[PDB]
Design an enzyme around this catalytic site. Structure first.
Site, PDB file in Angstrom:
ATOM      1  N   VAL H  49      23.935  74.345 -23.918  1.00  0.00           N
ATOM      2  CA  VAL H  49      22.604  74.719 -23.061  1.00  0.00           C
ATOM      3  C   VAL H  49      22.332  73.662 -22.382  1.00  0.00           C
ATOM      4  CG1 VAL H  49      20.175  75.613 -22.842  1.00  0.00           C
ATOM      5  CG2 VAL H  49      21.922  77.125 -24.186  1.00  0.00           C
ATOM      6  N   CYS H  50      22.162  72.614 -23.211  1.00  0.00           N
ATOM      7  CA  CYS H  50      21.475  71.054 -22.806  1.00  0.00           C
ATOM      8  C   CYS H  50      21.928  70.521 -21.623  1.00  0.00           C
ATOM      9  CB  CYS H  50      21.570  70.287 -24.054  1.00  0.00           C
ATOM     10  SG  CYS H  50      20.890  70.869 -25.487  1.00  0.00           S
ATOM     11  N   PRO H  51      23.428  70.578 -21.370  1.00  0.00           N
ATOM     12  CA  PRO H  51      23.815  69.913 -20.046  1.00  0.00           C
ATOM     13  C   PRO H  51      23.434  70.772 -18.605  1.00  0.00           C
ATOM     14  CG  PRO H  51      25.613  70.742 -21.207  1.00  0.00           C
ATOM     15  CD  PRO H  51      24.316  70.819 -22.338  1.00  0.00           C
ATOM     16  N   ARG H 126      13.885  73.122 -27.512  1.00  0.00           N
ATOM     17  CA  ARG H 126      13.735  72.925 -26.116  1.00  0.00           C
ATOM     18  C   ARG H 126      12.245  72.986 -25.738  1.00  0.00           C
ATOM     19  NH1 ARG H 126      18.993  73.006 -24.710  1.00  0.00           N
ATOM     20  NH2 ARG H 126      20.105  74.190 -26.451  1.00  0.00           N
TER      21      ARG H 126
END
EC number: 1.11.1.24
Lengths: 195, 197, 197, 197, 196, 196, 197, 197, 197, 195
Positions: H49-51, H126
């Protein structure tokens, strides 16, 4: 309350009432600066070994005085009891007249400072202290109650300390005046050992 | 870490490695129950007064053994330095052979328990302790570094304690074997005090 | 170390060596249960007011025993000094022979427990305690060093306390055997107060 | 909260409302500087032994005043109760008029400072203090509840302390004015001990 | 040492010596379980406002007993002083006979527990506590020294708490018996409010 | 966190947002120095006994201002709820216009300080405090939830404390203005007692 | 008192009085086991942003209910104020009837447990919590006072967590139902990263 | 180590090494005073999810700068990993070139300070923070690992906060530029509430 | 007593007595500022691996001196035992003369500061420390008792640190003089990495 | 949080995710019982000296395996970063494929337990640990950041420890297989010294 008496440190300061020459006088450890002092505790006036130690030192006092050494004795007895004891004939376990001071330590502060107080008995054990002329504690001798000390040994130790103080050599086991000393050097020591 | 050595109480327990007959052995204070023990500390191997004391007690060991009395010496040096010191010729300030166990106190635990440890120097002062056959501590003799102890005085003391243990009369100043003793009673004491005067 | 002596509570337990008829005996507070006890401290053997107080009580001891009451004296001096003092003639300020136990408090435990220890003199003040047959503390009398106590006042108090124990009347100021007493309730009391007015 | 009353030390300061000559005034321990003061606690107004003690000292006040000595009484009762008690006829167990101040200690601060407060009861015991002209506490006398104090013993004690204050000799057991005293010295003591024996 | 008096919690337990009909009796708070209790402290025997309150309550003590409510007064004075105060004629600021027990709090334990003790004075302030039959503290009234309490107000409050205890409605400001109450419901409350 | 309300000591300081004539104003206890102050807490806006008390006091507010005495009410409700409560018709348990400030104690700081906060409920009990012109707390009245206070009693107490403040005499039980007082002297008290 | 609300841990238990369907009922976090719950705090009844948020969620309740999701609102206001607010017409800034429970938190225990309480103000901020059917806290959204939350973002978040719960793929930035997801694996991740680039 | 992030208080100060346009630069929170800052943490470089989140913001960065707002992302990864990840092609799940600083929090100080560190995972969750131009924290958004955030929602919040800063109207649920606002007082509010009803 | 030796911080200060050229001298760590120092501990004089290490470094001393590098050895043995050990023939496990100072750590203070002290044994393990000319600690090598250290490895390390101090490029695994080094930059590093492959 | 790593005591237990043969596996210090283990920390993936140490050991792995010794490397980087690094060509400072496990220590617990964590940098220094087959820590080698370790020295030490383990003789300064050892006895030692 722990012992403050540590070898090679100043001897713990004390002051109190003593019987001197039949009279009550205030006495201080510092009154002895510039001389060696044999300072010794004994359990109790009107007891057994105790008078023999006091008399033994008292009757040989000149062997100390002729070497700049004084002798003081102390117990937890009051000064009134000390005097009464002095005015008791030797024949009945008294001291008779006596040339060494008898320090009184009723509050036990001095005995505690010297680490000789017996919490269970309310009095001292047989504790002797050799204090040099600079006021530094040099030797501690502690005996259980039933065995008295030795004036000859005490004498030998004063003489040894005075000698090492003066010459900066050291005294072997058993040293008496006239015996061989040792030069405290990894090399200089061989003079003594080699022969 | 405070001193545990108190006269008239059990001598503080110890145990360590010692050189006995040129051999490393585990030695404990309790090995000496049943005998009087002369347990003494000295500052440092390869120094001066120290070997003279060890030798003095060493050469005169039979005088103790015959009075049911052992002698153990101790310092902060390792057993390895002890052994080297034993293997050093007496004329070079060594010990030569020696029948007195040399206890090693590298961790300093034993010295501290006996109150003889010098924090500023990393070794002990000259501390001697007389412990009886029941393991009770009877006498403490503490010397500043430059002055050696006396074997004669030590012998006299052992004999004194042995006499009073047997008899219950107490020993006057200067007492030697054959000396007058005192009955520790207000009436009984007169036998001694009237006699001497 | 704070005082445990409280009126109307059990007297602080004590035990130690005393001189009783010339000999050293162990003595416990609890040995006096069943009897009244006049328990008193005096500062120092071979001093001044002290022997007069000890003697004053000793010579009048029968007056106390015939009312089920004992006397015990205590100082910080050793048992050996007590005995020397007893064997000192009265003319020299000794006690001569004496029927009152001289208790010894060398450790100061007892004096401290009774709140009579002078921390900076190293001995006690002139503290007297009246303890009943049930071990309860009933009366405390504390005198500064230079002024001696009174056997008479002590007797009056013991008589008064024994009386109030038996009868449940209370004793007015100055009561002696024979004097008026008060019934301690709001109605009964009037028999007393109305009488004398 | 611990007792601040120690013999040979300044008596603990107190101050409070007192009934004097029928009126509420503030009174202070320091108001008595220069005179001896007999300061005494009694348990409770409108009880039994208490009025007898107050009346005893009050009816004999001149025996104190003519020796430079005042008397103050204190209890935990309020000043209003003190006054009501004064206004109660002696026949009914009251005090009637009285010439000695009745100090009030509602907060218990004073009693607690003198160590006389009874935590279980909410009032004091029979505690009497002799305080010298210089403010020093000299003698403490404490009685359990049922037994009243003695005006005559108190007189003897005040007389004795005044004497020793002035002459620096010491007062033996039972001393009354005119009795033998003692020179407090291992030499001068025999003056008394040869005479009396 | 702090107050333990908390409304809607059990009143702090007490026991002590009291004068009951010229006699010394041990009194316990728990002796009153089952009845309401006006329990009130007054400062000092033989003073001024204190006797007027004690009397006002004693003379009207009946109005309280006929609604199952006892009354007990307390001060820091001894039982002996209490009794002497009773044996003093009213004309001299005494109480004369009195049917309310006078509890004695010599140790101050009780006053400190009820939070009414004045550290600077050594006696209580004018503190009154209404305690229900279940031993729960329902009301607390504390007056500074100069001002006396009111028996009427005290009656009203007892009547009030007894009402709500039974009917499960609540009493508006000023409520005397016979006055309109309120049903404590967001709807039921409207009968009361639509009236006025 | 414990009560700081002590009779005969300064009332614990407070400040907060209040609704004053439909407006949000900062109110301080020290705004009232110079006047007596009835300062009272009620449990909850939009409940039952609370509005009756507020109204009883507001309708009679004049009797207090003509003896130099202000009144202020407080609850743990927000100023917004306070204002909404004011803008609710009395016929619906609202207050309608009201001349007493309504102080808001959302944080409970003020209630905890006056020792009136109920930990289990999250609102105060019915606690009222009379504070003199010098800022000294003179009286404390605390009622359990079901029972409303009394304006009359509150008036009597204010009148009482104002009297003793001036004349240096004391008010017996039941004292209304015009009633006999007592001179607080062991002698002076006899004028009062010999009468009856 | 510290915040007990941690993502991926059980949401802190709460219970209290709530207004439901015009009535006071007790409500418990555990009453929502099995369903997703959107649990949210607003500052104050009868204020500004607060009614808009309550009304927004309430008017769109079916969008939550038809995805097995309930909504609860909470403030520090009492239940009585909650009800009065419900009975205020939307035109006057009231809520009018409402189908979502209004929880009451007078003690502040709940707000403090959720870490949303504002110590300086005496009420909460705009704190929203998404709690899953298994009772686990999944998302925390907190807004300063002036800015209202978004019903649509909340919907997207609930949808997203439900999706990942069920399929164990992960939801990229901006995911809406029907969007690409990612296999959370260094290998299967490329499925998504080749497609989209 | 507890969270220092509090809405309406200054955002916890941070500083550390970031990758800015391919280079290692030191970056301080205080470098953004005068501007709004969207400061967000993501779990781990080279994950899933991060990128997508980093890219989602990066590609829309102009939309933030044209409203005086910056974006900074942070993870526990080193600056060297950040750079490797940037030099990784998007097709392999890299970031490709990027205009948003990647801050490095190797010591975890920053994550801990913002309350987003997962103690037993060794990285953050997050967490996104909206900080105003005065350095005050205005909005906190915390998401569990599997669900990505929304650029749109973030923009709406920044717009809303900037708006309420300028005008002192407050923003209703769902507000976007153009929507109705409320005047936050009891009278003014009616202009809003009466309008929509 | 915790270890004070931390790499990249100043080496813990020491000072004591050491045998230098067969003579007792006071030696301090600060005497070595301006040079790299190889400071190492060994367990016990008159043992096994220990003399081999001292001799190894001793015989190869010029290799250090020529690179501006001194060597000091240390143990818990006294200076007296050290000197004896020096005066012992190498064939008997002695050292023979030696240009390396032998520091004495009788009090154990130095060993404890360097974290090499063995509490259970009363001596150190084999600990070597490389300190640079600015007195910063750069390398720590700790060996269990039975395994000796390496002079070659030590030399390589010193040279490595000296190289990187001068140049700022860093030394790869196994680096010896003449080896390839690395520029510690993400772009610069490629000169090394592209070359080797 | 202090170092638990003490020579001649069990090596501090660790477990975590490692990249092994391109995949994520749970790895435990105890998985290595019965073998010697060279356990070493390196600062950071995608840096400079670090890849050279990993590659140096990896390319010489058989010199350890042929003597019953395994090698594990650890940094504070995540396992995802480790894999990315592995999938980076050596030519650009990547590892390329690698036969030694890369342990991840994201929580820093393992680094802290081993006393190699740098509180100021958020990563490890150059710390290598030789752990014997019984799980006892035998050797600690710590390097400041700019200087890499030696596979030859590490090898010599493993071999020395294995030899003293087996024969109960001891290894002099510089010992390599074939060199003279010493009998650790005051007498037996003379075999070595005399010649």
């Amino acid at each position: 309350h722990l012992s403050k008496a540590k070898i090679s440190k100043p001897a713990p300061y004390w002051e109190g009432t003593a019987v001197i020459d039949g009279e009550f006088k205030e006495l201080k450890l510092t009154d002895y600066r510039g001389k060696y002092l044999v300072f010794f505790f004994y359990p109790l006036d009107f007891t057994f070994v105790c008078p023999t130690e006091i008399i033994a030192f008292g009757d040989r006092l000149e062997e100390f005085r002729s070497i700049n050494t004084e002798v003081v004795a102390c117990s937890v007895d009051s000064q009134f009891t000390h005097l009464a004891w002095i005015n008791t004939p030797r024949r009945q376990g008294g001291l008779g007249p006596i040339r060494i001071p008898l320090l009184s330590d009723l509050t036990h502060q001095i005995s505690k400072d010297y680490g000789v107080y017996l919490e269970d008995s309310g009095h001292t054990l047989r504790g002797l202290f050799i204090i040099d002329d600079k006021g530094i504690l040099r030797q501690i001798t502690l005996n259980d109650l039933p065995v008295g000390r030795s004036v000859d040994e005490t004498l030998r130790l004063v003489q040894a300390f005075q000698y090492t103080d003066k010459h900066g050599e050291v005294c072997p086991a058993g040293w008496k005046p006239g015996s061989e000393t040792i030069i405290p050097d990894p090399a200089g020591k061989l003079k003594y050992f080699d022969k």
